[PDB]
C-alpha cells in the first residue's frame, strides 16, 4: 500500500531519556514531523505523544 512518506516503524524498543524524548516500541508506527540538522534525531508522533527518537532505531515504511 502507498503510505505517507513520513510514516516510519520502530526497529527496536527505545526508552526515553528523559525530557521530551518520546518512548517507542519495536514494530510501532510513528509519524516523523521534523529532523535535527543531520537527520540522526527525529521529532516523532506515536500513539503515546510527541518527542525525539533516534533515526538509527526507526525506518520509513515505504519502499
Count CB atoms within 10 A of the CB of residue 36.
Answer: 11
Query: Cα–Cα distance between 43 and 63 in angstroms, integer?
Result: 21
What Å distances lie between residue 13 and 1, 26, 37, 44, CA to CA? 25, 5, 24, 14
Closest of 39, 17, 44, 16 to residue 28, by C-alpha: 44
Do 28 and 58 contact (CB within 8 A), yes or no? Answer: no
Beta bridge pairs of residue 52 = 21, 43
Q: Delineate the domains of the chain, giving CATH numbers in brackets.
A: 1-63 (2.30.30.40)
Query: Cα–Cα distance between 47 and 63 in angstroms, integer?
Result: 23
- DSSP letter for each residue of 15-34: ---SSSB--B-TT-EEEEEE
Query: Cα–Cα distance between 1 and 18 in angstroms, integer?
Result: 35
Do 51 and 20 contact (CB within 8 A), yes or no? Answer: yes
Q: Which technique was used to obtain these atomic coordinates?
A: X-ray
Closest of 3, 58, 42, 49 to residue 23, by C-alpha: 49
Amino acid at each position: 500500500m502507498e503510505n505517507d512518506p513520513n510514516l516510519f516503524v520502530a526497529l527496536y524498543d527505545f526508552v526515553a531519556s528523559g525530557d521530551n524524548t518520546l518512548s517507542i516500541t519495536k514494530g510501532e508506527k510513528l509519524r516523523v514531523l521534523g529532523y535535527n540538522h543531520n537527520g540522526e534525531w527525529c521529532e516523532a508522533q506515536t500513539k503515546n505523544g510527541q518527542g525525539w527518537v533516534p533515526s538509527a532505531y526507526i525506518t520509513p515504511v515505504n519502499s
